[PDB]
Nucleic acid binder design. Structure first.
Ligand SMILES: [Cl-]
Ligand code: NA
Ligand code: NA
Lengths: 67, 66
DNA sequence: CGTCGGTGAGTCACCGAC
DNA sequence: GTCGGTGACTCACCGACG
């Protein structure tokens, strides 16, 4: 019947929308987990560069102050 | 009444589904807040580095002048 | 207006863990 | 061998919109 075809087509459409909806949820999580892992790595590198520069600056202030 | 174990199962699985959806919402909110904070800490570090590199070179040119 | 798509929630089928 | 976790189908609900 046309009532059955219409009800089945609606279920197909909604099944497509649900799969897309679920996929976007998991992709957002996957994207965020990667960005967190990357930012942690980058900030560790940046912290070590800052630490070195601070010591280099400290020494240079001492070389300058010795004049 | 034999099929009443079926009813308790539906009630238990209903709560399990709600818990699964709530954990996914919490994880998303946790990761977003974590990302926001890490992005802020990265900006501050990049700022401190830029100022330290400037001061390093300033002192280097002061020293070369003496 | 009337139908659509996006989303929350209930359900089923399935699986892995203890 | 039972239980909870989760992917997927489904229905209810609502706002979007031609
Ligand atoms: Cl199907
Ligand atoms: Na699918
Ligand atoms: Na929960």
């Amino acid at each position: 019947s046309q009532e059955r075809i219409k009800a089945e087509r609606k279920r197909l459409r909604n099944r497509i929308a649900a799969s897309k909806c679920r996929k976007r949820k998991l992709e957002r999580i996957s994207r965020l987990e990667e960005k967190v892992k990357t930012l942690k790595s980058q900030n560790t590198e940046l912290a070590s560069t800052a630490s070195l520069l601070r010591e280099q600056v400290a020494q240079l202030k001492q070389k300058v102050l010795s004049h | 009444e034999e099929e009443e174990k079926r009813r308790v199962r539906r009630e238990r699985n209903k709560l399990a589904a709600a818990k699964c959806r709530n954990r996914r919402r919490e994880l998303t909110d946790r990761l977003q807040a974590e990302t926001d904070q890490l992005e802020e800490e990265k900006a501050e570090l990049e700022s401190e580095i830029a100022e330290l590199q400037k001061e390093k070179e300033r002192l280097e040119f002061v020293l070369v002048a003496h």
